[PDB]
Design a binder for this molecule. Structure first.
Ligand SMILES: O=C(O)c1cccc(/C=N/OCCCNCc2cc(=O)[nH]c(=O)[nH]2)c1
Ligand code: NA
Length: 223
């Protein structure tokens, strides 16, 4: 395996020598010496490994990786087998079941099948100390994942950006709405899910927008 997918590396490596990025690398490495940090190193960039950057169709922006054992694996909201879907993911699946008629809970939480179809599952912050939500916030990841969003904004067209909750909404504020589609609603966490997420119908809406972009739809059941 490689640490960072080749097509993504080609377009993002201009970030790597910037002071903030070297500092970020140093910070994460130091944290790993003294704490358990999630996801493990070979999974921090899973979101670069599942499809070619040119093949991205949909971008779902999250905030912090899961901070419990075995949960985070580098795709926002996803958990590898045999880990049970956490509450936010159960809510995503519940919305899918009402939005997409044929969708049924797949019995696992691994969203790799969406990532392979060009659904970029990007958290703003890409590492977290075990059991400490937001522990790696404002350490340099935000600038890097801003560069990812900016690259897609300027180098692709007709994407659908799904911004769930206030942090993702802030992070997507500069998306060119002449060039790309943007949908916004509440975060799927239990505390926020009934403030817009349930009933948002983002999955069917995304496929209709992809059709307007002249692109084939996502099969949300392909998991
Ligand atoms: O910005 C907002 O409006 C907002 C409002 C209420 C709750 C939250 C969410 N809190 O997250 C609860 C912790 C569980 N995190 C699941 C998860 C979130 C995520 O962004 N990325 C990820 O990979 N996994 C965000
Ligand atoms: Na060190």
């Amino acid at each position: 395996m490689e640490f960072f997918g080749e097509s993504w590396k080609k377009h993002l490596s201009g970030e790597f020598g910037k002071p903030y990025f070297i500092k970020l690398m140093g910070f994460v490495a130091e944290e790993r010496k003294h704490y358990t940090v999630y996801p493990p190193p070979h999974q921090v960039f899973t979101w670069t490994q599942m499809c070619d950057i040119k093949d991205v169709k949909v971008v779902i922006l999250g905030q912090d990786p899961y901070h419990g054992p075995n949960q985070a694996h580098g795709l926002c909201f996803s958990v590898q087998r045999p880990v049970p879907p956490p509450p936010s993911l159960e809510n995503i699946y519940k919305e899918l079941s009402t939005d997409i008629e044929d969708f049924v809970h797949p019995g696992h939480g691994d969203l790799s099948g969406w990532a392979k179809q060009g659904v970029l599952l990007l958290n703003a912050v890409l590492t977290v100390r075990a059991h400490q939500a937001n522990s790696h916030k404002e350490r340099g990841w935000e600038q890097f994942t801003d560069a990812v969003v900016s690259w897609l904004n300027q180098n692709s067209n007709g994407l659908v950006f799904l911004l769930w909750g206030s942090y993702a909404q802030k992070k997507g504020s500069a998306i060119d709405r002449k060039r790309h589609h943007v949908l916004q609603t509440a975060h799927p966490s239990p505390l926020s899910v009934y403030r817009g997420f349930f009933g948002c119908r983002h999955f069917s809406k995304t496929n209709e927008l992809l059709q307007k972009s002249g692109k084939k739809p996502i099969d949300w059941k392909e998991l």
